[PDB]
Design a protein around this motif. Structure first.
Motif, PDB file in Angstrom:
ATOM      1  N   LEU A  68     -27.976 -24.422  -1.264  1.00 26.09           N
ATOM      2  CA  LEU A  68     -28.248 -24.082  -2.658  1.00 26.09           C
ATOM      3  C   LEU A  68     -28.361 -22.700  -3.061  1.00 26.09           C
ATOM      4  N   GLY A  69     -28.927 -21.907  -1.941  1.00 24.51           N
ATOM      5  CA  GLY A  69     -29.023 -20.471  -2.127  1.00 24.51           C
ATOM      6  C   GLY A  69     -27.732 -19.962  -2.435  1.00 24.51           C
ATOM      7  N   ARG A  70     -26.722 -20.190  -1.434  1.00 25.17           N
ATOM      8  CA  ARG A  70     -25.446 -19.708  -1.798  1.00 25.17           C
ATOM      9  C   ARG A  70     -24.722 -19.927  -3.011  1.00 25.17           C
ATOM     10  N   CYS A  71     -25.046 -21.342  -3.426  1.00 24.02           N
ATOM     11  CA  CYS A  71     -24.655 -21.598  -4.891  1.00 24.02           C
ATOM     12  C   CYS A  71     -25.415 -20.741  -6.112  1.00 24.02           C
ATOM     13  N   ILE A  72     -26.656 -20.928  -5.816  1.00 17.43           N
ATOM     14  CA  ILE A  72     -27.388 -20.013  -6.818  1.00 17.43           C
ATOM     15  C   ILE A  72     -27.348 -18.547  -6.756  1.00 17.43           C
ATOM     16  N   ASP A  73     -26.960 -17.972  -5.689  1.00 15.13           N
ATOM     17  CA  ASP A  73     -26.597 -16.301  -5.623  1.00 15.13           C
ATOM     18  C   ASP A  73     -25.397 -16.305  -6.365  1.00 15.13           C
ATOM     19  N   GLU A  74     -24.424 -17.177  -6.242  1.00 16.04           N
ATOM     20  CA  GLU A  74     -23.078 -16.927  -7.031  1.00 16.04           C
ATOM     21  C   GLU A  74     -23.437 -16.943  -8.520  1.00 16.04           C
ATOM     22  N   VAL A  75     -24.047 -17.834  -8.788  1.00 18.03           N
ATOM     23  CA  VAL A  75     -24.403 -17.941 -10.309  1.00 18.03           C
ATOM     24  C   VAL A  75     -25.124 -16.692 -10.650  1.00 18.03           C
ATOM     25  N   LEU A  76     -25.753 -16.301 -10.445  1.00 10.33           N
ATOM     26  CA  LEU A  76     -26.868 -15.013 -10.448  1.00 10.33           C
ATOM     27  C   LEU A  76     -25.871 -13.763 -10.585  1.00 10.33           C
ATOM     28  N   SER A  77     -24.798 -13.632  -9.507  1.00  5.05           N
ATOM     29  CA  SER A  77     -23.984 -12.781  -9.527  1.00  5.05           C
ATOM     30  C   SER A  77     -23.240 -12.661 -10.771  1.00  5.05           C
ATOM     31  N   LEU A  78     -23.050 -13.783 -11.271  1.00  2.44           N
ATOM     32  CA  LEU A  78     -22.046 -13.848 -12.555  1.00  2.44           C
ATOM     33  C   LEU A  78     -22.803 -14.143 -13.922  1.00  2.44           C
ATOM     34  N   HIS A  79     -24.293 -14.153 -13.809  1.00  4.99           N
ATOM     35  CA  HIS A  79     -24.890 -14.354 -14.886  1.00  4.99           C
ATOM     36  C   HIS A  79     -26.175 -14.001 -14.620  1.00  4.99           C
ATOM     37  N   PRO A  80     -26.595 -12.648 -14.214  1.00  7.43           N
ATOM     38  CA  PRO A  80     -27.985 -11.978 -13.765  1.00  7.43           C
ATOM     39  C   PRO A  80     -28.980 -12.620 -14.760  1.00  7.43           C
ATOM     40  N   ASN A  81     -28.824 -12.165 -16.028  1.00  6.11           N
ATOM     41  CA  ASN A  81     -29.934 -12.637 -16.903  1.00  6.11           C
ATOM     42  C   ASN A  81     -29.842 -14.022 -17.505  1.00  6.11           C
ATOM     43  N   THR A  82     -30.033 -15.328 -16.678  1.00  5.38           N
ATOM     44  CA  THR A  82     -29.846 -16.538 -16.955  1.00  5.38           C
ATOM     45  C   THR A  82     -31.263 -17.280 -16.428  1.00  5.38           C
ATOM     46  N   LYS A  83     -31.677 -18.374 -17.245  1.00  4.77           N
ATOM     47  CA  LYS A  83     -32.747 -18.970 -17.313  1.00  4.77           C
ATOM     48  C   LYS A  83     -32.557 -20.122 -16.224  1.00  4.77           C
ATOM     49  N   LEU A  84     -33.061 -19.970 -14.993  1.00  4.32           N
ATOM     50  CA  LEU A  84     -32.700 -21.191 -13.839  1.00  4.32           C
ATOM     51  C   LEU A  84     -33.817 -22.253 -14.198  1.00  4.32           C
ATOM     52  N   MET A  85     -33.180 -23.377 -14.294  1.00  6.18           N
ATOM     53  CA  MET A  85     -33.859 -24.719 -14.685  1.00  6.18           C
ATOM     54  C   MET A  85     -33.538 -25.826 -13.474  1.00  6.18           C
ATOM     55  N   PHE A  86     -34.309 -26.695 -13.470  1.00  6.47           N
ATOM     56  CA  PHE A  86     -34.187 -27.976 -12.681  1.00  6.47           C
ATOM     57  C   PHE A  86     -34.834 -29.288 -13.051  1.00  6.47           C
ATOM     58  N   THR A  87     -33.978 -30.041 -12.807  1.00  4.18           N
ATOM     59  CA  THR A  87     -34.354 -31.483 -13.347  1.00  4.18           C
ATOM     60  C   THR A  87     -35.129 -32.218 -12.114  1.00  4.18           C
TER      61      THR A  87
END
Length: 218
Positions: A68-87
């Motif tokens: 998950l971290g590998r995935c989340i880091d990629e999204v952060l690298s691509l959208h640093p100011n993004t609101k991380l949520m979880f269902t």
């Protein structure tokens, strides 16, 4: 614009219902963006598994923190100011008003649960905002992410012509009112005559009165 990133292990579900009617139209139009990330792609693990059994045992599996971290880091690298949520079903209960507060951010990321949940470190390390669309257990978080996305995207402008937009907001509470349309009789059920009169004032008045009943049954 308005961007949504969805992290799931079932990317074939999307856009699903999100891609249809106004919602899909506006999506092609590019009024909003839908980035769907396959979590399975991030497993560098040789077993190439995303899930695993839980330390301490018990049922089902849990999505691995390293994947998950590998995935989340990629999204952060691509959208640093993004609101991380979880269902998950035990988080902030999602409401039309919570939706509005989310509009303040223009780039939301929605991690979807699967199996028995996710490794807690991910919740903690990344400081996820847990969100619940209601008091029920789903097979996973993706129906949740859809409900959230649908709810919010309807409040982007251009997705809904200002006609149905300034309206809905007019009704104010859950009441709205009884609505009717052709035929004038159907199984001998006829339309309240006031609607057939063209009398705007007298119709608005009747619609407020009918708005107060039904709700009175609440």
């Amino acid at each position: 614009s308005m961007i949504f990133n969805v992290l799931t292990i079932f990317p074939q579900m999307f856009p699903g219902p999100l891609g249809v009617s106004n919602l899909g139209s506006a999506l092609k139009k590019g009024l909003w963006t839908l980035n769907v990330f396959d979590i399975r792609a991030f497993a560098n693990n040789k077993h190439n598994t995303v899930d695993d059994t839980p330390y301490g045992g018990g049922p089902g599996m849990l999505l691995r923190a390293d994947v998950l971290g590998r995935c989340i880091d990629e999204v952060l690298s691509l959208h640093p100011n993004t609101k991380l949520m979880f269902t998950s079903p035990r988080g902030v209960s999602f409401t039309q008003d919570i939706a509005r507060q989310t509009m303040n951010f223009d780039n939301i990321t929605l991690l979807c649960g699967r199996f028995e949940g996710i490794d807690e470190r991910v919740v903690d390390f990344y400081k996820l905002q847990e969100v619940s669309i209601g008091d029920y257990v789903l097979s996973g978080g993706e129906l949740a992410a859809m409900v959230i996305i649908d709810t919010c995207v309807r409040m982007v402008p251009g997705v809904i012509g200002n006609a149905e937009s300034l309206k809905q907001e007019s009704m104010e509470g859950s009441l709205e009112y009884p609505q009717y349309t052709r035929p004038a009789s159907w199984k001998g059920m006829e339309v309240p005559e006031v609607l057939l009169t063209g009398n705007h004032g007298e119709i608005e008045k009747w619609r407020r009165n009918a708005s107060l009943s039904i709700t009175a049954a609440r």
